[PDB]
């Protein structure tokens, strides 16, 4: 217990740093506890805005708090304090990217947790930027693989291949391919870059319309019996089978 009167701002990550209310040399000193560990440090500020530590594994810990209290950057290092093992960057809005590292410092794993709670798990990340990917959603899981170019998550029902492609940077594009030649059931879609909507057109009749929200969900507002107007209203998809039925 450093102090209880001259001290405890409990944010942005699930952590509380104890700013002082000066130290021996003009810099407010601040302390935080992270998983049974005491991280001590100093700062020219008096609002929480770096912390060192040493694990019983001889390792090194360096928690960083931004100068506006909007991020934590909890870094765990090897015994030299330069080669890192695990760097988790949590943000204020509960969005975070956690990473693990190999002996040569390359990224082994990477888990991007969005604000809305949806995850994006990367495993077996090769030295080239590739590996096995998966996306944990609200009510279902998507699966795919990774190349450094794009993150590719694919859903197939029979001949149809629904590919959801993610830019390196966050942008989302969707593709659809069908191997049927029957123009009576050749499921063909046309992406919309603006409204972020995929629009199936089966047998020259638009049969449904699939939006991808900025909140990472999938909607279904089917068209009329002639493919001329939207009938009913959009329903959020909660199970994966309901997506295969969208291609069915």
């Amino acid at each position: 217990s450093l102090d209880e009167k001259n001290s405890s701002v409990d944010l942005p990550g699930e952590m509380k740093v104890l700013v002082s209310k000066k130290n021996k040399d003009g810099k407010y000193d601040l302390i935080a506890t992270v998983d049974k560990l005491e991280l001590k440090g100093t700062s020219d500020k008096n609002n929480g805005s770096v912390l060192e530590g040493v694990k019983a594994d001889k390792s090194k810990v360096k928690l960083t708090i931004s100068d506006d209290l909007g991020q934590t950057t909890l870094e765990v290092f090897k015994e030299d304090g330069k080669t890192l093992v695990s760097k988790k960057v949590t943000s204020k809005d509960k969005s975070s990217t956690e990473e693990k590292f190999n002996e040569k410092g390359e990224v082994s794993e990477k888990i991007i947790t969005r604000a809305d709670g949806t995850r994006l798990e990367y495993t077996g990340i090769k030295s080239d930027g590739s590996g096995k990917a998966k996306e944990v959603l609200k009510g279902y899981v998507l699966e795919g693989t990774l190349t450094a170019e794009k993150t590719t998550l694919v859903v197939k029902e029979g001949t149809v291949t629904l590919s959801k492609n993610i830019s390196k940077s966050g942008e989302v594009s969707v593709e659809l391919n069908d191997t049927d030649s029957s123009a009576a059931t050749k499921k063909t879609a046309a992406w919309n870059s603006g409204t972020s909507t995929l629009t199936i057109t089966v047998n020259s009749k638009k049969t449904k319309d699939l939006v991808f929200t900025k909140e990472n969900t999938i909607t279904v507002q089917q068209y009329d019996s002639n493919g001329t107007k939207l009938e009913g209203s959009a329903v959020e998809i909660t199970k994966l089978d309901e997506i295969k039925n969208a291609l069915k």
Partner: antibody, heavy 121, light 101 residues
Framework: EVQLVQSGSEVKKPGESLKISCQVS????????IGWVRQMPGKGLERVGF????????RYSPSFQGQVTISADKSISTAYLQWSSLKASDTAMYYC??????????????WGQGTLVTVSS | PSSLSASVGDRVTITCRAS??????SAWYQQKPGKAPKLLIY???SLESGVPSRFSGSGSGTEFTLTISSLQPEDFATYYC?????????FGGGTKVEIKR
Amino acid sequence: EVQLVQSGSEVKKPGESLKISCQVSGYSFTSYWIGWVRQMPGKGLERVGFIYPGDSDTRYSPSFQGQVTISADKSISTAYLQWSSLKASDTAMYYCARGILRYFDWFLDYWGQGTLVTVSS
Amino acid sequence: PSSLSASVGDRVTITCRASQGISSGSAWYQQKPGKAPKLLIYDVSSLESGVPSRFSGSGSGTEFTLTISSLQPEDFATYYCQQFNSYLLTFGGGTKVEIKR
């Protein structure tokens, strides 16, 4: 104490092949990366390439891939940078350093003192 | 590159502006004439071991900052800035700090 001792200065003619050494000592040669930097006279630095001696994982700057060749030797803790046929433009000082790999690039922890490479007809 | 004229005791902040900014962090080096550069800052606040506390590094996004609280004589050298952007490769063009008289 960690020391990186590069080979001596070299004077060569367009076409000749050159090897340059860098003998590290003071840390586990294999547990980190080793790399080279090109500093042309009165100019800034240029990352050329890095290797990882633990598995001889070599990675080249795109400005050099095909032009230069990097290797190492665990038994002597030496790193190497070499050319097949030197060009006049190669005339620079080349530094050898220890990289740490921040996602795309290495920041350079320790440096060697050499090495001057004059190349002229 | 660029140059700078300052006297002893002055406070200097070198700014490092990235063209296309996704950087993840930065690093700084000090090169005196005819000598191997020295690592000052990594992971924008480091310090490298053996650097006086008068050296501090901060920044965010595309813009990174190296600062010396008060200049000393040994601090007169060229200073480079390394961003970890996908952009590559050479370095910051360099910034040399000359003595004012």
